[PDB]
Amino acid sequence: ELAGNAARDNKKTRIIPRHLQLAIRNDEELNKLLGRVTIAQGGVLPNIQAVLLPKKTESHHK
Amino acid sequence: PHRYRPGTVALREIRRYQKSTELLIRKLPFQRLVREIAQDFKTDLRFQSSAVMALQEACEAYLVGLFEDTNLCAIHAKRVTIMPKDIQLARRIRGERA
Amino acid sequence: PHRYRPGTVALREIRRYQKSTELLIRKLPFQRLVREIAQDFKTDLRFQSSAVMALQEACEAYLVGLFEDTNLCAIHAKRVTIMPKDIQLARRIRGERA
Amino acid sequence: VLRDNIQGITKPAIRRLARRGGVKRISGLIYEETRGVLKVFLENVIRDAVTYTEHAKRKTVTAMDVVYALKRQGRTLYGFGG
Amino acid sequence: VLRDNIQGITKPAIRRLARRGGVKRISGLIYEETRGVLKVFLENVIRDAVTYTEHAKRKTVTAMDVVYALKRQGRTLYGFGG
Amino acid sequence: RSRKESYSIYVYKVLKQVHPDTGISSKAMGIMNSFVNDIFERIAGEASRLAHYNKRSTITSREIQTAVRLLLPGELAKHAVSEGTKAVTKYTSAK
Amino acid sequence: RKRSRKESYSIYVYKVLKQVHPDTGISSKAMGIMNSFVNDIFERIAGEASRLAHYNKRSTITSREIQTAVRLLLPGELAKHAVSEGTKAVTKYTSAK
DNA sequence: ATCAATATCCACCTGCAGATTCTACCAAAAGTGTATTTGGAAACTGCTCCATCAAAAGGCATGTTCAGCTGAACCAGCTGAACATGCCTTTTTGGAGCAGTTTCCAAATACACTTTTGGTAGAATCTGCAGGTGGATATTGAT
DNA sequence: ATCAATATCCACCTGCAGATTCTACCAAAAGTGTATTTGGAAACTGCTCCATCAAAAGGCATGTTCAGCTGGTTCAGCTGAACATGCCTTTTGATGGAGCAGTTTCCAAATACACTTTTGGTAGAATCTGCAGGTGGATATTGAT
């Protein structure tokens, strides 16, 4: 279910491992269950630490 | 000539590789390293190709996780530059004594 | 009046408790905490005394290990003072997400 | 008057433990964090202990229940049988 | 000329991995450390894999051997069978 | 010719039950199969240990339930337990 | 008349203790720790050997499985010396029929 | 620099913890039988090694740029220790459950027969996906 | 500090390879139906250890006060990265072929299971003793004006 939700989010009709990894890591309970599990071809979450991103001095107010 | 500031391209690369899942290490040198190491334990061993792919998957996931912990240690130390001591700390805390 | 500098007595206390193995938490408040928490899951439960002693042993060993990792994080951060963020980092790295 | 009883894990006991942990200097805010950490740790252990307890149809928590709960959390304890 | 072949895990590949790890800036000395870390990790896995291999009286390392080696190191891998 | 069993067909039926208009890669199906195998082994092993601890020679649904409560967190465990209970009662009913 | 019977490895540890250091005792708590240790490593080894056997569709657990399990679980020289001793023991057993 | 507190050394005297004898009684081995299992021989096809050749994407040295690391200085507030004392921890009877026994009974295995459905070979469609337009969002270097 | 210029990302078809779905056949896996059995629920007993809070001794927790000392902060210099580009190199891939090695499979003895008997080792009670702990004192360690 969650993987199909991620697929629709990506406008995809076929479930891929990416969606399974996204699903797992985006679910607190599954993340706990599979915290020490490696999903082949899963990649990682788009998680960037707030302090490494460029400043509010970004040059485009508008 | 047009010139981007330091960090912009790094961030773009982060976003690119974090959006994708393809393997970032070259297949052949990895096979050669594996074969050399295994050779040091037992001679004339063979490997299934998918076994090598599995080893690569494990290795890369392990390395990104270590670099993540390293990054948190650096940030904790008010830095943005990772250092050996950060890796050593992260590995020590996981108990990867070695 | 005679006066010792800050740290000397702390170090003596470290040496003392690291030389010994006796439990540092009071038995009764620990029993009461355990009983309260367990009560919140199931009513009118009882506990063997050695079960409480076991729980205390586990708890204290866990806490010293966390404080050890915390101390390493502090030293890593060029500090000698432990902070919540150090504990949070150590627990995050072990995966004690909570 | 009592204060939810978590306060019986007093500051000096935590100080002693930290000293055994080799800590020389401690922020004042550490203590409550440690208490919270302990509660989480404890809850999980006791929760599992009671589950084992419930399985045996017993109303008395045994040391073995604790041992098994600890083992499944990867925190093996020696010295109390089994 | 080759250089013990560990050098094929090149700096830019490590850079890419660190970027996936969210790293923005990297000391030059990190790379060799990472290589060393990898060798240790790898050695243990492969060592166990070969042990499983040896037990089966086989001369070909299978994916399952890797999977079991990884599991016993607490590094469960999904996607390759079993 | 040999014979390799998998859970593929059941996953595919379930996928059609939850999302009729959606496919799945073979690699993903393999991941689901790996998952299933892992949880199977985890549960059976834990049940085995409990039975051993209780000097019990039989693995019943009680041990399964208990193992689940130990392994799964909160609502996931509660819903799984409720489903298993409902299933056993349905099995016991329709003899 | 009622009575039960609790087994332990205590006497064997004490015999070994007397073999290596004749003038030394051991507390009951420490002996309990040693018994816990023995039980833990026993369970670890049998479980691992069992898994290998299942992986290889083998219904028999042999000295090879013990050895392999040891090689997986124990490190370097500790493993080598334990392995040598085990081999020595099986060889002594097999001849002493 | 030493002397005031700290911890180490030494002495000695008990008791209780632990080392040691005396049972019996549980299981650990000796001896038939049998039933499974491993290893060995011979076919045998899948696959992994190997090399060799033609792109192809990326590695890699070089140098220009400037922002991150790190050191000097310093302030200030926060944390550490003595001292006083309060107070809460430790020390000093029954009965709620915890283990042992019988027993008898629901439920789980074992065996034979029959069905079903999931592996597996082979045919066919639909969408992921490379690529060709079109405009917008994300960055700098003048605004 | 962000607006007029750059220029990566998106939007959206669009064919099309090739994944993926569907279709058919086998036999191995599940299921029905009968006999036996044995594990465990439930009564029911003996005990053992654990809930109960009362009050005193004493020693550890709380809290005050003060000092000091270190963690926060700013400034500034340097150096160790970041990053463009040229251009070399060392992957990729296809593709093709030799040989090896996983796999099957067929068969006889090896190995271990399983049932029955006689030991004899070990658990446990009961006894004895000797070393760890208390408790005090003398003495080498170690740290502030």
From Swiss-Prot, chain A:
Disulfide cysteine pairs (residue numbers): none
Modified residues (N6-crotonyllysine): K55, K56, K62
Residues the record lists as N6-glutaryllysine modifications: K32, K55, K56, K62
Chain positions found as N6-(2-hydroxyisobutyryl)lysine: K11, K12, K32, K55
Posttranslational mods: Monoubiquitination of Lys-56 (H2AK119Ub) by RING1, TRIM37 and RNF2/RING2 complex gives a specific tag for epigenetic transcriptional repression and participates in X chromosome inactivation of female mammals. It is involved in the initiation of both imprinted and random X inactivation. Ubiquitinated H2A is enriched in inactive X chromosome chromatin. Ubiquitination of H2A functions downstream of methylation of 'Lys-27' of histone H3 (H3K27me). H2AK119Ub by RNF2/RING2 can also be induced by ultraviolet and may be involved in DNA repair. Phosphorylation at Thr-57 (H2AT120ph) by DCAF1 is present in the regulatory region of many tumor suppresor genes and down-regulates their transcription.
Positions in coiled-coil regions: none
Modified residues (N6-succinyllysine): K32
N5-methylglutamine: residues carrying this PTM: Q41
Residue list for modification N6-(beta-hydroxybutyryl)lysine: K32, K55
Modified residues (Phosphothreonine): T57
Subcellular location(s) of the protein: Nucleus; Chromosome
Cross-link Glycyl lysine isopeptide (Lys-Gly) (interchain with G-Cter in ubiquitin), sequence positions: K56
Subunit structure: The nucleosome is a histone octamer containing two molecules each of H2A, H2B, H3 and H4 assembled in one H3-H4 heterotetramer and two H2A-H2B heterodimers. The octamer wraps approximately 147 bp of DNA.
Family: Belongs to the histone H2A family.
Name of the featured protein: Histone H2A type 1-B/E
Organism listed in the record: Homo sapiens
Species lineage: Eukaryota, Metazoa, Chordata, Craniata, Vertebrata
Swiss-Prot record, chains B, C:
Modified residues (N6-lactoyllysine): K19, K42
N6-(beta-hydroxybutyryl)lysine sites (modified residues): K19, K42, K85
Cell compartments where the protein resides: Nucleus; Chromosome
Entry-annotated residues carrying N6-acetyllysine: K19, K42, K78, K85
A GO CC term assigned to this protein in UniProt: protein-containing complex
Positions of post-translational N6,N6,N6-trimethyllysine modification: K19, K42
Modified residues (N6-glutaryllysine): K19, K42, K78, K85
Modified positions (Phosphothreonine) in chain numbering: T43, T70
Residues that bear Phosphotyrosine: Y4
Major location category of this protein: nucleus
N6-succinyllysine PTM positions: K19, K42, K85
Disease as annotated in the protein's UniProt record: Glioma: Gliomas are benign or malignant central nervous system neoplasms derived from glial cells. They comprise astrocytomas and glioblastoma multiforme that are derived from astrocytes, oligodendrogliomas derived from oligodendrocytes and ependymomas derived from ependymocytes. The mechanism through which mutations lead to tumorigenesis involves altered histones methylation with gain of global H3K27 methylation, altered Polycomb repressive complex 1 (PRC1) activity, aberrant epigenetic regulation of gene expression and impaired differentiation of mesenchimal progenitor cells.
Annotated protein name in UniProt: Histone H3.1
Upper classification of the organism: Eukaryota, Metazoa, Chordata, Craniata, Vertebrata
Parent-protein start and end of this portion: 39 to 136 of 136
Curated annotation (Swiss-Prot), chains D, E:
Modified residues (N6-lactoyllysine): K11, K57, K71
Subcellular localization(s) per the UniProt record: Nucleus; Chromosome
Top-level taxon of origin: Eukaryota
UniProt-reported outcome of changing P12A: In TEBIVANED1
GO biological process: chromatin organization; negative regulation of megakaryocyte differentiation; nucleosome assembly; protein localization to CENP-A containing chromatin; telomere organization
Reported effect, K11R: Abolished ufmylation
Cited function: Core component of nucleosome. Nucleosomes wrap and compact DNA into chromatin, limiting DNA accessibility to the cellular machineries which require DNA as a template. Histones thereby play a central role in transcription regulation, DNA repair, DNA replication and chromosomal stability. DNA accessibility is regulated via a complex set of post-translational modifications of histones, also called histone code, and nucleosome remodeling.
Name of the featured protein: Histone H4
Protein's organism: Homo sapiens
Segment of the intact protein contained: 22 to 103 of 103
UniProtKB/Swiss-Prot annotation, chain G:
PTM description: Monoubiquitination at Lys-6 (H2BK34Ub) by the MSL1/MSL2 dimer is required for histone H3 'Lys-4' (H3K4me) and 'Lys-79' (H3K79me) methylation and transcription activation at specific gene loci, such as HOXA9 and MEIS1 loci. Similarly, monoubiquitination at Lys-92 (H2BK120Ub) by the RNF20/40 complex gives a specific tag for epigenetic transcriptional activation and is also prerequisite for histone H3 'Lys-4' and 'Lys-79' methylation. It also functions cooperatively with the FACT dimer to stimulate elongation by RNA polymerase II.
Record-listed Phosphothreonine modification sites: T87
Record PTM N6-crotonyllysine, positions in chain: K6
Modified residues (Omega-N-methylarginine): R58, R64
Name of this chain's protein: Histone H2B type 1-J
Annotated positions of the N6,N6,N6-trimethyllysine modification: K57
GO cellular component terms, A-Z: CENP-A containing nucleosome; cytosol; extracellular space; nucleoplasm; nucleosome; nucleus
Residue numbers carrying N6-lactoyllysine: K15, K57, K80, K88, K92
Residues modified as N6-(beta-hydroxybutyryl)lysine: K6, K57, K88, K92
PTM-bearing positions, type N6-acetyllysine: K57
N6-succinyllysine: modified positions: K6, K88, K92
Subcellular location: Nucleus; Chromosome
Residues annotated with N6-malonyllysine modification: K88
N6-methylated lysine: residues carrying this PTM: K88
Entry-annotated residues carrying N6-methyllysine: K18, K80
Quaternary context: The nucleosome is a histone octamer containing two molecules each of H2A, H2B, H3 and H4 assembled in one H3-H4 heterotetramer and two H2A-H2B heterodimers. The octamer wraps approximately 147 bp of DNA. Heterodimer H2BC11 and H2AZ1 interacts with VPS72 (via N-terminal domain).
Family classification: Belongs to the histone H2B family.
Residues modified as PolyADP-ribosyl glutamic acid: E7
Phylogenetic classification of the source organism: Eukaryota, Metazoa, Chordata, Craniata, Vertebrata
One GO MF term: structural constituent of chromatin
Example of a GO biological process term: killing of cells of another organism
Keyword rRNA-binding attached: no
